[PDB]
């Protein structure tokens, strides 16, 4: 057998790409996009139809250039999601404009707007995850959105504070990061070689998974962002794992069954009082890796948003 097939016994496999070609090749349960992958996917010549559709659609909403840019960029990301939904039986994750990350009300509105576009194309909410950065503001947006029947994927999750607050908000899914935590440690410590079980992104996701199962939380744990297949196999058992095509290819080409690494066989323990905002801020900011990587990820995705708008502006 091969390591991809073996992994699927323990973990739901999700493809982290806007490339529909990968969905046919790997046949994942779900798919995830983010603003960088939408920008990359938007630049593939074969996707020009989706852009053109998005723009034509945008042009039939308003006569305002600034608004058309918004409508077209939203619609393009949803258009990509619809193509993926034709080829995957589960969820598509679509991420809000990252410039909204510290704004709860704007994030709630933007999530409702994307849900509306998806519903207008005949997709129910049970096939969509709206992706929001796991800042306090995004977590509060998610708590409200779930109550309104909108399922969320809380992403760029780096600190335990973030993990706990997402669990207590009752979010449908978390995407705790792995590879970018490895990046931070190599960059900020002497040690630049880790065995899989000591990879600090692996440690983080493993700890979060235990805290989640230990307290009976229903939020799905989906490890995300990988540097190597060693990291993935060390997280076999994770509810879901979203994996880039390059690493899906390496798993599929690797021979030999793997063991399940991540389990919780135990009692549902009682939950603490909920973390307050002040406690969350203290605790997140105790973690210098999370301080850096949350802020950075939001910055980079906002830049991708701006580039997408520059492309769309050039087509209006």
UniProtKB/Swiss-Prot annotation:
Species: Escherichia coli (strain K12)
Family: Belongs to the transaldolase family. Type 1 subfamily.
Record entry for activity regulation: Inhibited by Tris-HCl and phosphate buffer. Also competitively inhibited by sugars with L configuration at C2, such as D-arabinose-5-phosphate and L-glyceraldehyde.
Classification via CDD domains: Transaldolase_TalAB (cd00957)
Keyword Repressor annotated: no
Any Pfam family the entry gives: TAL_FSA
Stated name of the protein: Transaldolase B
Reactions the enzyme catalyzes: D-sedoheptulose 7-phosphate + D-glyceraldehyde 3-phosphate = D-erythrose 4-phosphate + beta-D-fructose 6-phosphate
Residues in coiled coil: none
Catalytic residues as annotated in Swiss-Prot or TrEMBL: 131 (schiff-base intermediate with substrate)
Entry's Gene Ontology BP terms: carbohydrate metabolic process; pentose-phosphate shunt, non-oxidative branch
GO annotations of cellular component type: cytosol; membrane
Any one GO molecular-function label of the UniProt entry: transketolase or transaldolase activity
Keywords: Cytoplasm, Pentose shunt, Schiff base, Transferase
HAMAP family: Transaldolase_1
Subunit structure: Homodimer.
Cited InterPro entries: Aldolase_TIM, TAL/FSA, Transaldolase_1, Transaldolase_AS
Temperature dependence: Optimum temperature is between 15 and 40 degrees Celsius. At temperatures above 50 degrees Celsius, activity is lost rapidly, and at 55 degrees Celsius, the enzyme is totally inactivated.
Statement: the UniProt record of this protein carries the keyword Membrane: no
Task of the protein: Transaldolase is important for the balance of metabolites in the pentose-phosphate pathway.
pH dependence: Optimum pH is between 8.5 and 9.5.
Pathway membership: Carbohydrate degradation; pentose phosphate pathway; D-glyceraldehyde 3-phosphate and beta-D-fructose 6-phosphate from D-ribose 5-phosphate and D-xylulose 5-phosphate (non-oxidative stage): step 2/3
Gene that encodes it: talB
Main location: cytoplasm
EC number: 2.2.1.2
């Amino acid at each position: 057998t091969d390591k991809l097939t073996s992994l699927r016994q323990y973990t739901t496999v999700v493809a982290d790409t806007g490339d529909i070609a990968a969905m046919k090749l790997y046949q994942p349960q779900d798919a995830t996009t983010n603003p960088s992958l939408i920008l990359n996917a938007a630049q593939i010549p074969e996707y020009r139809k989706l852009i053109d559709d998005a723009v034509a659609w945008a042009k039939q909403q308003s006569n305002d250039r600034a608004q058309q840019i918004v409508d077209a960029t939203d619609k393009l990301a949803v258009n990509i999601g619809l193509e993926i939904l034709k080829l995957v039986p589960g969820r598509i994750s679509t991420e809000v404009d990252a410039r909204l990350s510290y704004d709860t009300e704007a994030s709630i509105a933007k999530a409702k707007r994307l849900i509306k576009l998806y519903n207008d194309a005949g997709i129910s909410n049970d096939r969509i995850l709206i992706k929001l950065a796991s800042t306090w503001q995004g977590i509060r947006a998610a708590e409200q959105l779930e109550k309104e029947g909108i399922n969320c994927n809380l992403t760029l999750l780096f600190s335990f504070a973030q993990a706990r607050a997402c669990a207590e908000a009752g979010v449908f899914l978390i995407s705790p990061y792995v590879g970018e935590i490895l990046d931070w440690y190599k960059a900020n410590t002497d040690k630049k070689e880790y065995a899989p079980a000591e990879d600090p992104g692996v440690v983080s996701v493993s700890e979060i998974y235990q805290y989640y199962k230990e307290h009976g939380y229903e939020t799905v744990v989906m490890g995300a962002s990988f540097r190597n297949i060693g990291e993935i196999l060390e997280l076999a058992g994770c509810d879901r794992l979203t994996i880039a095509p390059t690493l899906l290819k390496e798993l599929a080409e690797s021979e030999g069954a793997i063991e399940r690494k991540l389990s919780y066989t135990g009692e549902v323990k009682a939950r603490p009082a909920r973390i307050t905002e002040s406690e969350f801020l203290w605790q997140h900011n105790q973690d210098p890796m999370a301080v850096d990587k949350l802020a950075e990820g939001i910055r980079k995705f906002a830049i991708d948003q701006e580039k997408l708008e520059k492309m769309i502006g050039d087509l209006l």
